[PDB]
């Protein structure tokens, strides 16, 4: 099964309907990615 936990640098984006890597968007990240990106 698939895992998308913000604590491991990933979140399910409910606008895009997909799991997104926080590392790929740091600096333009949403609140889900605050822990990982900061």
């Amino acid at each position: 099964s698939l895992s998308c936990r913000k604590e491991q640098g990933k979140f399910y984006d409910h606008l895009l309907r997909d799991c997104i890597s926080c590392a790929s968007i740091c600096g333009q990240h949403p609140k889900q990615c605050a822990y990982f990106c900061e």
């Binding site: 409910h14 606008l15 895009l16 968007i25 600096g27 333009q28 990240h29 949403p30 609140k31 889900q32």
Partner: protein, 137 residues
């Protein structure tokens, strides 16, 4: 005569620990009686086919911004349309409006929601930047 409802922002809400921002709506044009704004949602009182349109103006460097328009009724949720805009990383460039619309069957008792799936989304509350409307066909 076609029922119409055009709504503009009066406020914004984003609950703590959520990843959602919503707009509180106020009517500026109304004819007929089959829809009613109730804060951040719109209540459907008359079953029928409606043209729904939605614009949000974003000033936000978040990689993508946009809105999701859904209907909730009879224990179910259905997404009607989404609008998605990629944003630049520089704040002085990071302005984009996001418009979408379509024609949909809505049932009495349904609730229509317009959600921005980011916490504390930076959107304009200007009535000519961000708005929501309905025409019963």
């Amino acid at each position: 005569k076609h029922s119409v409802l055009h709504l503009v922002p009066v406020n914004i809400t984003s609950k703590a620990d959520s990843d959602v921002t919503e707009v509180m709506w106020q009517p500026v044009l109304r004819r007929g009686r089959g829809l009613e704004a109730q804060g951040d949602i719109v209540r459907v009182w008359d079953t029928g086919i409606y043209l729904l349109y939605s614009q949000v103006l974003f000033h936000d460097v978040t990689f993508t911004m946009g809105q999701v328009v859904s209907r909730e009724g009879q224990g179910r949720r259905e997404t009607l349309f989404r609008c998605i805009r990629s944003m630049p990383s520089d704040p002085d460039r990071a302005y984009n409006s996001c418009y979408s619309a379509g024609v949909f069957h809505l049932h009495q008792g349904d609730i229509i929601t317009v959600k921005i799936p980011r916490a504390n989304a930076k959107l304009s509350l200007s009535p000519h930047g961000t708005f929501l409307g309905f025409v019963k066909l």
